[PDB]
Each structure stands twice: as C-alpha cells, then as structure tokens.
Homo-oligomer: A and B are copies of this chain.
Amino acid sequence: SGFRKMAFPSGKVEGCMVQVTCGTTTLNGLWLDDVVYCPRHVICTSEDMLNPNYEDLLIRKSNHNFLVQAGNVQLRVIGHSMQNCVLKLKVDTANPKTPKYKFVRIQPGQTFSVLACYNGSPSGVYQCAMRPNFTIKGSFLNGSCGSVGFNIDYDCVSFCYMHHMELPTGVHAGTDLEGNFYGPFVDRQTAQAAGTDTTITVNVLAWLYAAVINGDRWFLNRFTTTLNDFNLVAMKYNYEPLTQDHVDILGPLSAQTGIAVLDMCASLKELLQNGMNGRTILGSALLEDEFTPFDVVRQCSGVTF
C-alpha cells in the first residue's frame, strides 16, 4: 500500500554527471561514451546572453577553453560542436560508467525523473511532468543548468531533458538531448513567458485509479459519460482533451478496478463541478496530474531496474 511520487533510481545517470567550466560559467554536463553534452549558453557572458550568435562565439573557442571535470579527474576536450541548443564536447576518454541509453523526446503529460546537479555533483532526484505549456515545475537554483531528465526502460536510460533556464514565474525550460527546446522558448536573456497551463487529464484519471487500488473510493459514482461530453466539461476547467488513445492506455487500470474509463470520467466531472468537500484523495486536496497511467501500473505492480 501507499502511493508516492517516485523517481527512477538515479545511479545509471549519476555516473554520467560531470562539471563543465567555460570562462566564468560552470554548469553540468552529461558524459556518454566520449562526448560531454551541456547547454550551449555555457559559452556566453551576461552581455552575450542578451543577443547571442552561438556559431560566432563557438568559432572563437578552442578545446582548451572548456574545462571538463569528472569527479576529481580532468577530462581533455579534443573537439567541440553544436547541435541546436546543446554543446557536444568530444573528450579523449570514454565514460566507463556509460549505461545502455537512448535520446528520446517526450510529449506533454509524460513524466520523467530529474537528477538535479551542481558542479557536476548530483544533489537530488525528483519526479515531474512536462506540462502541456512545455515547462516543468522543477526545483532548481543557479548552477543547475545541464541537469538531466530521464526514464528507465528495463536497463536502458532514455534521456529526455536537459535543463537550460528558469522563466520569470519560477517554472523551468529546457531541451531534449538533441538540443531542441520543449516549448516556444529560446536560450537568450529576453522577455519570455510560459503559456497558460492546463491539467493533464489522462494522468488525473490514472491517479484516481491508483487511489481506488489503494482503497480510496468515496469519489466513485454510478454515472458514466460520453467522451465528447467529458471533453466539453474538461475544456471548460482548463483540462487537456482526453483522446481515444488515452482511454485505451487506461484500459488495464479500468480492467483491474472494474471502473470503465468513461465511468471514472463521470467521477472526475463531478469532482471538477463540485470540489472535494473537505475530503482528500491519496492525502491530497487537489487532483494530482504528474502520474501517468504507466507510472501507476509500475508503482502498483513493483517493476524493477
């Protein structure tokens, strides 16, 4: 029993965290095989960040300008290239701790674990979701740039995020491991704002199924709804539309609990129009949307890595 916000074990990623220093800027790098990946803004000054030409700044750099430190060992940079908003520093040594890995770009609503690092040293791990507005509500201070987001598939690490910046609202923006930003963001000191956020509906439903598996049933009702009627209500409360793909993904939880997805949608509809009435679900007074249907199955069935 119990339901917690749970991250993947971070060990396979900890062995890849290195410190990257370029001039006065120090941030984190991901060392996989003989390449260290990090945000390309490491080559910037405070003036450069205002309106940067990264090709012109990088062409002025030499390999010896980048100081890469893995633990108490300095790696020697033998090449440098840029892929979108990520800098790739070729090193002479392949990371012996390199796990089986993939670079994957995730969709909004998908969750992943963040290994927050400072000076190439892992300080914490937390689970979060890529919001529908493409920001992540992370926890990061200055020095955390280059911290990575990941999932674990059997024994394969899927790297899906690299932290680049904090928006004025305190939310975070970053890229996949190919340097492509999630969202309409750029890596420059300019006026940027996150769009209005919405609730990840499929994840709320998956969390309601986790509550039922844990014995919380007060919110269940006799009612069902059409997918269309549910979406009209959901859209009114800034909830993401629930697609037939989402209904199919919730299939196993629906079969396990005996509550059809559209039957759980009617519970969610009433929760939205009426509130919780001083009650909680899994010790929460708000509907939790940072657990995917896969996370719920993984936690309520004990899948290991």
Binding site for B on A (CB under 8 A): 1-12, 14-15, 115-119, 121-128, 137-141, 143-144, 166, 170-172, 214-215, 280, 283-286, 298-305
Determine how close the nearest CB of chain B comes to the CB of A24; give it in whole angstroms.
18
Chain B residue nearest to A142 (CB atoms) is B302
Determine how close the nearest CB of chain B comes to the CB of A200; give it in whole angstroms.
14
Chain B residue nearest to A8 (CB atoms) is B124
Determine whether the beta carbon of A170 is less than 8 Å from that of B123: no
Determine whether the beta carbon of A141 is less than 8 Å from that of B302: yes
A123 in contact with B304 given A2-B172, A283-B137 (CB within 8 Å): yes
Determine whether the beta carbon of B11 is less than 8 Å from that of A137: no
Q: List 16 A-B contacts (CB under 8 A).
A: A1-B139, A1-B166, A2-B166, A3-B139, A4-B128, A6-B124, A6-B139, A8-B124, A11-B11, A121-B305, A122-B305, A137-B283, A141-B302, A144-B302, A170-B215, A280-B286
In the complex, what distance in Å separates the CA atom of A142 from the CA atom of B299?
Answer: 12
A125 partner residues in chain B, CB cutoff 8 A: 6-10, 125
Chain B residue nearest to A10 (CB atoms) is B9
Contacts A1-B140, A118-B304 supplied; 16 other A-B pairs, CB < 8 Å: A1-B170, A2-B137, A2-B139, A2-B172, A5-B5, A6-B125, A6-B126, A7-B125, A8-B125, A9-B11, A119-B304, A137-B283, A141-B300, A170-B215, A283-B286, A284-B286
A299 partner residues in chain B, CB cutoff 8 A: 124, 139
Looking at the complex, which one of B7, B119, B138, B285 makes contact with A124 (CB distance below 8 Å)? B7
In the complex, what distance in Å separates the CA atom of A137 from the CA atom of B125?
Answer: 19
In the complex, what distance in Å separates the CA atom of A91 from the CA atom of B300?
Answer: 33
Determine how close the nearest CB of chain B comes to the CB of A143; give it in whole angstroms.
7
In the complex, what distance in Å separates the CA atom of A124 from the CA atom of B141?
Answer: 24
Determine how close the nearest CB of chain B comes to the CB of A99; give it in whole angstroms.
11
A122 in contact with B7 given A2-B170, A137-B283, A140-B1 (CB within 8 Å): no
Question: 7 closest Cβ contacts across the A-B interface?
Answer: A11-B11, A1-B170, A121-B304, A285-B285, A2-B139, A4-B139, A9-B122
Determine how close the nearest CB of chain B comes to the CB of A18; give it in whole angstroms.
13
A117 partner residues in chain B, CB cutoff 8 A: 304
Determine how close the nearest CB of chain B comes to the CB of A256; give it in whole angstroms.
14
Chain B residue nearest to A15 (CB atoms) is B11
Determine whether the beta carbon of A9 is less than 8 Å from that of B124: yes
